[PDB]
Amino acid sequence: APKELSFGARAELPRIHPVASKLLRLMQKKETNLCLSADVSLARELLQLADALGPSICMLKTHVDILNDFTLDVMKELITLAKCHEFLIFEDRKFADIGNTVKKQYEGGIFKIASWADLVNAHVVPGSGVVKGLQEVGLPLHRGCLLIAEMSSTGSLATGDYTRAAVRMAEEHSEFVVGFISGSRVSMKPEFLHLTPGVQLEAGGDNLGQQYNSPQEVIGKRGSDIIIVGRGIISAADRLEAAEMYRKAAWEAYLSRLG
Amino acid sequence: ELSFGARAELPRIHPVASKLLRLMQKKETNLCLSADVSLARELLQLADALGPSICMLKTHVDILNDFTLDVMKELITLAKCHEFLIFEDRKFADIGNTVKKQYEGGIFKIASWADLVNAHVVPGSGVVKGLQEVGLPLHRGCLLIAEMSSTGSLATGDYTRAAVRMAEEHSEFVVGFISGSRVSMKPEFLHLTPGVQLEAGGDNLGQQYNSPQEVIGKRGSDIIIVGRGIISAADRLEAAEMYRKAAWEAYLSRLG
Ligand SMILES: O=c1[nH]c(=O)n([C@@H]2O[C@H](COP(=O)(O)O)[C@@H](O)[C@H]2O)cc1F
Numbered sequence: 269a270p271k272e273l274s275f276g277a278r279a280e281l282p283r284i285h286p287v288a289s290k291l292l293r294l295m296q297k298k299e300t301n302l303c304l305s306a307d308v309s310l311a312r313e314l315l316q317l318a319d320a321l322g323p324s325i326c327m328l329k330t331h332v333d334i335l336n337d338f339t340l341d342v343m344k345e346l347i348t349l350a351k352c353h354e355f356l357i358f359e360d361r362k363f364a365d366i367g368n369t370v371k372k373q374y375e376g377g378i379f380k381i382a383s384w385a386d387l388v389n390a391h392v393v394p395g396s397g398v399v400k401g402l403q404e405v406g407l408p409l410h411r412g413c414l415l416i417a418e419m420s421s422t423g424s425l426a427t428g429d430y431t432r433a434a435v436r437m438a439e440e441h442s443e444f445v446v447g448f449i450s451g452s453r454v455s456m457k458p459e460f461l462h463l464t465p466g467v468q469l470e471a472g473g474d475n476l477g478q479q480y481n482s483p484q485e486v487i488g489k490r491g492s493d494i495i496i497v498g499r500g501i502i503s504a505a506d507r508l509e510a511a512e513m514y515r516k517a518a519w520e521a522y523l524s525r526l527g
Numbered sequence: 528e529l530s531f532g533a534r535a536e537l538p539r540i541h542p543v544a545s546k547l548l549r550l551m552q553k554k555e556t557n558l559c560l561s562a563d564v565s566l567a568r569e570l571l572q573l574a575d576a577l578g579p580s581i582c583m584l585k586t587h588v589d590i591l592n593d594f595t596l597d598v599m600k601e602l603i604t605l606a607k608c609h610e611f612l613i614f615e616d617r618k619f620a621d622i623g624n625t626v627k628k629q630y631e632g633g634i635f636k637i638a639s640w641a642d643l644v645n646a647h648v649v650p651g652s653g654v655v656k657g658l659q660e661v662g663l664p665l666h667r668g669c670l671l672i673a674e675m676s677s678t679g680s681l682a683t684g685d686y687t688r689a690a691v692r693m694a695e696e697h698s699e700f701v702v703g704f705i706s707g708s709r710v711s712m713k714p715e716f717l718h719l720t721p722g723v724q725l726e727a728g729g730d731n732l733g734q735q736y737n738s739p740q741e742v743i744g745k746r747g748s749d750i751i752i753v754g755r756g757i758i759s760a761a762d763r764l765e766a767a768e769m770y771r772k773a774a775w776e777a778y779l780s781r782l783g
């Protein structure tokens with residue numbers, strides 16, 4: 269690798285994207301590189317965790333299509349907490365169709381994602397058309413995309429030349445693409461953000477192919493910026509204490525990589 | 528090559544695939560309609576008017592500004608009345624644990640109405656396992672996306688092989704594929720193909736079209752998915768029959 273810059277230094281890079289830069293500054297302001305994967309089926313419970321975990325997090329990740337009681341005002345209440353506790357909103361929609369379709373799924377329908385989500389992700393299997401169709405909606409609204417360069421699940425096919433291609437598609441769309449979902453550092457340009465799912469303190473998995481690694485491994489050894497943690501916190505008796513442990517473990521793992 | 532009625536009686540066929548293959552033969556249609564509309568009222572009006580010409584209605588429920596579960600009830604009534612399957616083009620593409628919840632829950636409750644849904648293989652077989660837990664209870668099927676119609680698509684080579692292997696090994700839930708071509712030798716598997724137009728073209732955003740003759744006749748696919756080719760017409764029924772006959776005859780000519 270080359271010489272590691274800090275998040276603050278990174279937020280000021282000439283080729284940096286506005287969304288990433290906003291994120292990075294808050295990562296250094298609050299000493300949090302923890303993304304809370306808020307996997308819940310009630311609007312109310314998503315708002316309760318956002319309000320309480322907010323000070324501990326640099327991002328909130330949502331699957332909005334798991335909410336039973338989704339209304340746009342629930343996203344208006346969630347922007348409030350995001351504006352106030354300071355975190356980005358990341359809708360984990362994983363766009364994966366052709367340009368023309370993804371474009372309408374991003375702007376329209378019942379979810380109106382592009383009107384409240386700073387960040388979305390897209391798979392790269394369709395070719396760059398997915399990104400091109402997304403950028404027509406997201407740019408006008410000052411948004412970024414993350415491109416799924418690798419996956420944490422067993423038997424995942426995002427490896428090899430697949431991964432190299434996500435990275436390419438990202439460079440060539442730097443004006444919209446702000447980084448990656450991956451398991452390690454996949455790009456050498458520091459203007460790109462790395463976010464890693466499949467993270468738990470203790471070694472393990474689930475019964476449907478999720479593989480877990482630890483914050484130290486993911487941030488220290490592998491190069492990630494940020495960790496996405498779901499059940500590792502959400503399941504806990506004390507979700508605040510859980511969030512804090514993951515905060516401190518990831519933060520310190522980053523400090524240690526820096527010098 | 529077997530016919531569509533013969534395939535319906537294959538020992539290893541899935542109940543959904545079976546129900547599908549029958550009405551195709553009963554109706555002489557292998558046209559799936561990609562109904563990409565924002566207004567539910569147009570959605571139903573197409574389903575009603577074009578029902579007899581189609582074997583499947585493919586939806587993007589997330590693109591509908593006025594989604595209610597009653598729209599879906601009304602749609603199910605027309606599907607029962609005109610005999611087509613409902614395909615929610617959702618493309619599940621996350622991990623086992625998440626897709627199960629996306630498939631079963633939330634606003635859309637896709638499993639309560641969709642005969643068929645689809646999923647990307649990219650995560651590995653966990654995706655299918657998550658879906659099959661909700662799906663199997665309810666007599667549902669999945670199509671895997673093995674190839675894609677767009678420029679620079681990564682669903683090629685080893686990727687395509689892995690979808691095939693993955694379908695092979697979950698044939699209790701996976702009733703076939705989204706692809707540009709025949710990708711399986713096993714006639715139990717349905718092959719449905721998007722990026723279908725009569726005239727050679729593309730759009731400005733990655734889409735590449737081939738023709739019903741090319742797709743059903745030369746490439747060995749079973750069903751054609753057609754969105755803009757029909758919806759953009761002044762007269763959607765006229766266009767639908769045009770695609771039906773094109774596809775239907777392209778199939779007979781493959782049979783011998
Ligand atoms: O590769 C991935 N793995 C994932 O787990 N995810 C999401 O992160 C979350 C991780 O949840 P966990 O409970 O921490 O495993 C879950 O919502 C998944 O949909 C996304 C990915 F892109």
Ligand SMILES: O=c1[nH]c(=O)n([C@@H]2O[C@H](COP(=O)(O)O)[C@@H](O)[C@H]2O)cc1F
Nearest residue numbers: 365369561675676705721722753754755
């Ligand atoms: O590889 C694919 N190509 C596609 O075009 N599609 C979808 O089929 C539909 C075909 O649309 P058209 O209007 O006929 O291009 C559309 O809804 C796309 O999302 C799906 C695929 F899986």
